[PDB]
Design a protein around this ligand. Structure first.
Ligand SMILES: *[C@@H]1O[C@H](CO)[C@@H](O)[C@H](O)[C@H]1NC(C)=O
Lengths: 50, 49, 24, 50
């Protein structure tokens, strides 16, 4: 319980990387968050908008 | 159209170019997919309404 | 008559393997 | 009546509704399968998952 200052710095860096990785699964308004779905389902003109 | 027929399609292989290469069709709009890619895909179910 | 369900009636929500994880 | 103008003539309509779920496939395109190459770095496609 005394070393909470060092564990807090580890926890903040871990939460920042876990937030960065979870945001890969977000759609942002595209057809899928999986870039390979878009490229396997759509042609150049329609894919590039997604 | 008030009582449309849903023909379920499953457990089979489909060449969609048999459809989209035919001049018999007046329109062939697709949403979320392109006709060119349909021969590269697979689906859990297909419903022909 | 009635009875308490406790924790019961959980099921696998999708046909996806997941392990050593908490999923919402 | 067969003498109607084009917008008032009958048209046959089909909607091919597609679904791929968090599940197996049952409908597929005409594409050839091939042998499984383990341990190498390989490009792959399983049921349309590129
Ligand atoms: C819920 O079930 C218990 C056990 O039978 C009973 O005592 C209680 O009155 C019930 N309450 C409601 C709102 O059904």
């Amino acid at each position: 319980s005394a070393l909470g200052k060092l564990q807090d710095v580890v926890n903040q860096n871990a939460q920042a990387l876990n937030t960065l990785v979870k945001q890969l699964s977000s759609n942002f308004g595209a057809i899928s968050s999986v870039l390979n779905d878009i490229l396997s389902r759509l042609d150049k003109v329609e894919a590039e908008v997604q | 159209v008030y009582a449309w027929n849903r023909k379920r399609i499953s457990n089979c292989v489909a060449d969609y170019s048999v459809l989209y290469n035919s001049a018999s069709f007046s329109t062939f709009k697709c949403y979320g997919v392109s006709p060119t890619k349909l021969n590269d895909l697979c689906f859990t179910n297909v419903y022909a309404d | 008559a009635y009875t308490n369900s406790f924790t019961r009636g959980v099921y696998y929500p999708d046909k996806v393997f997941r392990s050593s994880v908490l999923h919402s | 009546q067969p003498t109607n103008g084009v917008g008032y003539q009958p048209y046959r309509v089909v909607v091919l509704s597609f679904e791929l779920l968090h599940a197996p496939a049952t409908v597929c395109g005409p594409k050839k399968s091939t042998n499984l190459v383990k341990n190498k770095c390989v490009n792959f496609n399983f049921n349309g998952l590129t």
